């Protein structure tokens, strides 16, 4: 946990919305 | 997203 | 072939006979560089007659 901590993978209910959509526009 | 084939140098006419 | 060691300025002397003689297909078969040429075996004694004018 001290060296190289990874944020755990959480599942989305709708994954295309967080994948395909642009965030800076 | 475009042509990107340099066609005027390979096939000039 | 037949290895023939000659002079760079004399190599073209045998090339002119290649484009002039109509006996075979081609006289010189492989031109290595400027002091080494190859040849079908038959014209060394004939070339000795041309020494009087060379």
């Amino acid at each position: 946990v001290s060296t190289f901590p990874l944020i755990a993978a959480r599942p989305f209910t709708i994954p295309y919305l967080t994948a395909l959509l642009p965030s800076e526009l | 997203p475009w042509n990107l084939s340099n066609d005027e140098y390979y096939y000039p006419k | 072939g037949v290895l023939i060691e000659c002079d760079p300025a004399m190599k073209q002397f045998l090339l002119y006979l290649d484009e002039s003689n109509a006996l075979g297909k081609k006289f010189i078969i492989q031109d290595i560089d400027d002091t080494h040429v190859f040849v079908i075996a038959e014209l060394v004694n004939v070339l000795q007659e041309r020494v009087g004018e060379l």
């Binding site: 989305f12 209910t13 994948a19 959509l21 642009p22 | 390979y10 006419k13 | 297909k25 081609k26 031109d31």
Partner: protein, 963 residues
């Protein structure tokens, strides 16, 4: 001439769907068919139905008796002890042929009542009213219901018809053949906040008396088959095309700007396909639906196409624009020549697949250039020669086994392996390019226009198939139309490349006769390999001599070996004159590397790819370097790059470096020259003089003039130096020192490319360039020097790999907060963690990839994680991971993921038939036989994938590891 295998002719079909329940995943409906018997004493009528519970059937409003049996549910009996695959392939072919509507058969057998026999003998109409219900479908209709609360439109729940070929039997009873054309009437009663998209044109949309549901009425007056009828019900955002106004685009909610940008090119695809052919688009509307958890990436039905939402990109996304563009283009090509003109048998499928692929290649030629066309044609030809030399061959147009060299039957599309289906379409469009080579392109487009014009005169009649079978093409009709427009018949070319199933292999070597000034070629064929055949036709060869480029035609009969062609002068070495090229131009060549006695600079056997061939020519290395530099053909530059890997001389390094520095070279040649230069640099270690390869060239092309180690800020507006910039460190990381370890000068260079990356200034995204940077970091990993199997812990980590691991940890964690376009950096970081685990750096633990392979993740992350788990269970011989993968094949919600797991477990198998493994039980043989027999009975693509997996693991005979 088309004669039906069915004893009845179907005229009209009404499909009404009520009560689409999304919570219970259930539809109710009826189907009313209007058949005319062609033979008297019809008695039984045999229709196709899978997964539908048939409630009642009434023929002419009289109650009739039906019997249902599906032999393809359990192909072989449970209590048969057979375990060989040839038995299952014959039983599966017989079971699919017993439900085949292309024979007279079918799964639902309805008995005509007795009082209608006087109505059926003198051939009068019969109206069959079946009403059915899908209780919880495992195939056909796919219900994507998310687990957010709210109304079904507020959470984004939708249905779509999935499957390939004849898979419309999976959601309503029909005659599910491509030859039974009828007109259609489609009603769908959906929720008031949802829209139902289907085939035809929407005549009206009426409300229900409570105004909580509405009924969409579609009508299809162009007679299509049942297999071309589709459905998409959901809360779609509607967008009318602002250029063409009969084209509506439907997307999932919150994805309207991506839909606007993505589907803005499609009018140019319409204009192309309507000006090379001279028919307009045959249907009255066009509808593009973008959905989630799609079966295939692009499906094309009558007047409708169903794409996945993963094709939707924004304006700042490059490296995805051409792929989505060509998916739209091939969907439209299949709209013209798979849905309007249909198939007469299962043979003559090569005609439709070839015309679709060929006109899509013509679109690619006009859109992306002739050079991209040649590169695509060469990659398809290499694909097919690799597949046909690997296993047997692809047989277009078989005659009914005709192909017994391969473990499945080619009589039906649903018994084909998926790789065979892909190579079938690929070979069909290459054979159509060959027919264009023999009979010119304008005559070819006239053939296609004649087929379309016969179909469109046929499409407006009302006669029930007196004339509706002119919309069905066959092989004999296609060859007859070719012979009508051209006067030449192609029967030798058809006999060689269609009916015969093989590719040819050419081994060439030359010798220059200086005496007679001739070029003696020596071309011999390998015709005794399993995939090969013997070529006896003519063969073009192009020789570039000092006087120019000359073409010669060689007649390669069976007993032929030496072909003497004449050579020209060498008077362009006497004077310095420019040497004229294949095109009209001429260039200055450095003739110091050329032989003094030979005028010829390079030779190319079959330059135009006019046969399905694999050439192995033996030139000299300077001829390959001249062909790389001065050729005006991209396939010859690619094959010279491919042949320069065997000659690691510094002149070849100079040739590839001059190709890399050269703009006005095609960019995919320079991207290949990067990897070729990396391989050559690895082979001439302890001879290499200066810096590592391509580093000085990278700092010359893409870095600042004042700072060599600081990269320029990202401006990706050129699209050719963007691709070259993102491919050059990936090849540069394959450099190795004398100690077989990647140098710390290239790894430091890649890490400085990662640190100094600034993307706040270009109008394009950085996700693919950063993902390629992670791929370059993964390429540098050499296997670690474990001592006495020391446990890989954090303290005994490599000092090189700690920097790489810190960078991929930073990238993956930053992706968890600021995600990329399609989680490209997640896929690249999972791939790099698997690279570090494959060597002895990170502990070999599949728990991270098992957490990324859960259901709620994006599908690219899922398939990357499942690829890592398949690689782990191959290397670590894990039993429980193989049981995890087989369980995920059996019950996963997305069927594309199940097909991909079977595909990856076939490509990277846990064991082959030759290996002794601990995972060769009778338990695994029984599990995979149960997965072929039952279990995969609902998809037709999982069952062929299970057959492929059983063939890869246990072979065609009896599993050996068994009592």
């Amino acid at each position: 001439g088309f004669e039906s295998p069915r004893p009845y002719k179907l005229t009209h079909q009404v499909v009404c769907i009520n009560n689409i329940n999304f919570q219970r995943k259930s539809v109710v409906g009826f189907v009313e068919l209007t058949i005319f018997p062609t033979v008297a004493n019809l008695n039984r009528i045999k229709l196709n139905s899978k997964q539908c519970r048939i409630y009642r059937v009434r023929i002419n409003d009289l109650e009739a008796a039906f019997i249902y049996n599906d032999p393809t549910l359990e192909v072989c009996h449970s209590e048969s002890k057979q375990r060989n695959l040839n038995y299952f392939s014959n039983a599966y072919a017989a079971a699919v042929s017993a439900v085949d509507p292309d024979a007279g058969n079918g799964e639902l057998c309805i008995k005509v009542p007795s009082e209608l026999w006087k109505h059926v003998d003198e051939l009068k109409v019969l109206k069959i009213h079946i009403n059915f219900s899908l209780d919880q479908p495992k195939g056909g209709l796919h219900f994507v219901v998310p687990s957010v609360e709210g109304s079904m439109a507020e959470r984004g729940a939708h249905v779509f018809s999935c499957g390939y070929q004849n898979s419309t039997r999976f959601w309503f009873p029909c005659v599910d053949s491509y030859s039974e054309l009828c007109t259609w009437k489609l009603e769908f009663t959906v929720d008031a906040a949802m829209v139902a998209v289907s085939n035809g044109d929407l005549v009206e949309t009426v409300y229900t008396h409570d105004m909580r549901k509405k009924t969409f009425h579609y009508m299809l007056t162009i007679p299509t088959a049942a297999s071309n009828i589709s459905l998409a019900i959901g809360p779609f955002e509607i967008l009318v095309d602002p250029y063409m106004h009969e084209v509506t685009h439907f997307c999932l909610p919150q994805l309207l700007p991506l839909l606007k940008h993505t589907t803005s090119y499609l009018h140019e695809v319409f204009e192309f396909y309507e000006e090379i052919l001279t028919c307009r688009y045959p249907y009255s509307c066009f509808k593009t639906v973008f959905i989630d958890e799609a079966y295939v990436e692009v499906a094309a039905y009558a007047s409708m196409s169903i794409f996945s939402t993963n094709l939707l990109h924004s304006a700042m996304i490059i490296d995805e624009t051409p792929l989505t563009r060509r998916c739209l283009a091939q969907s439209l090509a299949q709209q013209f020549f798979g849905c309007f003109i249909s198939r007469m048998s299962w043979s003559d499928e090569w005609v439709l697949k070839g015309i679709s692929g060929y006109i899509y290649g013509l679109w690619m030629k006009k859109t992306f250039g002739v050079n991209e066309y040649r590169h695509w044609i060469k990659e398809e030809l290499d694909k097919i020669v690799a597949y046909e030399l690997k296993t047997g061959g692809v047989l277009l147009h078989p005659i009914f086994n005709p192909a017994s060299h391969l473990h499945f039957s080619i009589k039906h599309p649903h018994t084909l392996s998926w790789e065979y289906y892909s190579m079938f379409q690929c070979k069909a469009h290459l054979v159509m390019r060959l027919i264009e080579n023999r009979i010119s392109m304008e005559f070819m487009l006239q053939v296609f226009n004649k087929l379309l014009s016969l179909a469109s005169t046929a499409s407006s009649q009302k006669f029930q198939s007196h004339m509706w079978s002119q919309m069905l093409v066959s092989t004999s009709g296609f060859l007859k139309s070719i012979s009508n427009v051209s006067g030449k018949d192609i029967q030798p070319l058809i006999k060689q490349w269609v009916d015969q199933s093989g590719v040819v292999k050419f081994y060439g070597s030359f010798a220059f006769n200086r005496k007679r000034n001739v070029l003696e070629l020596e071309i011999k064929q390998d015709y005794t390999s399993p995939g090969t055949q013997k070529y006896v036709g003519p063969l073009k060869v192009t020789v570039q001599e000092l006087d120019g480029s000359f073409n010669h035609t060689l007649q390669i009969e069976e007993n032929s070996l030496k072909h003497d062609i004449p050579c020209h002068s060498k008077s362009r070495r006497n004077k310095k004159k420019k040497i004229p090229l294949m095109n009209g131009e001429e260039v200055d060549m450095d003739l110091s590397a050329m032989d003094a006695d030979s005028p010829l600079l390079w030779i190319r056997i079959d330059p135009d790819m006019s046969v399905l061939r694999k050439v192995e020519f033996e030139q000299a290395d300077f001829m390959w370097q001249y062909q790389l530099r001065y050729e005006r053909d991209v396939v010859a530059q690619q094959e010279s790059i491919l042949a320069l890997e065997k000659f690691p001389t510094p002149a070849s390094r100079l040739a590839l470096t001059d190709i890399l520095e050269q703009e006005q070279c095609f960019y995919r040649v320079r991207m290949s020259a990067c990897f070729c230069l990396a391989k050559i640099a690895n082979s001439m270690v302890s001879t290499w003089t200066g810096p590592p390869a391509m580093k000085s060239l990278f700092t010359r092309m893409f870095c600042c003039k004042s700072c060599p180690n600081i990269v320029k800020t990202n401006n990706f507006m050129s699209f050719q130096s963007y691709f070259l910039q993102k491919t050059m460190p990936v090849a540069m990381a394959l450099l190795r020192d004398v100690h077989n370890l990647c140098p710390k000068e290239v790894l430091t260079f890649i890490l400085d490319l990662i640190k100094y990356n600034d993307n706040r200034k270009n109008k394009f995204s950085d996700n693919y360039y950063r993902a390629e940077m992670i791929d370059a970091l993964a390429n540098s990993v050499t296997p670690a020097v474990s001592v006495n199997n020391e446990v890989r812990t954090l303290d005994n980590l490599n000092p090189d790999v700690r920097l790489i691991l810190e960078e991929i940890t930073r990238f993956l964690n930053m992706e968890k907060l600021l995600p990329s376009y399609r989680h490209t950096i997640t896929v690249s970081c999972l791939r790099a963690i698997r690279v570090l685990q494959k060597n002895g750096h990170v502990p070999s633990d599949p728990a991270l990839f098992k957490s990324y392979a859960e259901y709620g993740h994006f599908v690219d992350i899922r398939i990357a994680a499942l690829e890592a788990v398949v690689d782990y269970t191959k290397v670590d011989r894990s039993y429980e991971e193989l049981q995890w993968l087989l369980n995920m094949i059996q019950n996963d919600p997305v069927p594309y993921v199940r097909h991909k797991i079977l595909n990856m477990l076939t490509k990277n198998p846990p064991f082959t038939k030759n290996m002794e493994s601990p995972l060769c039980n009778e338990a695994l043989v029984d599990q995979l036989w149960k997965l072929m027999n039952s279990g995969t009975s609902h998809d037709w693509r999982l069952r062929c994938g299970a057959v492929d997996l059983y063939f890869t693991l246990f072979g065609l005979s009896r599993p050996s590891c068994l009592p």
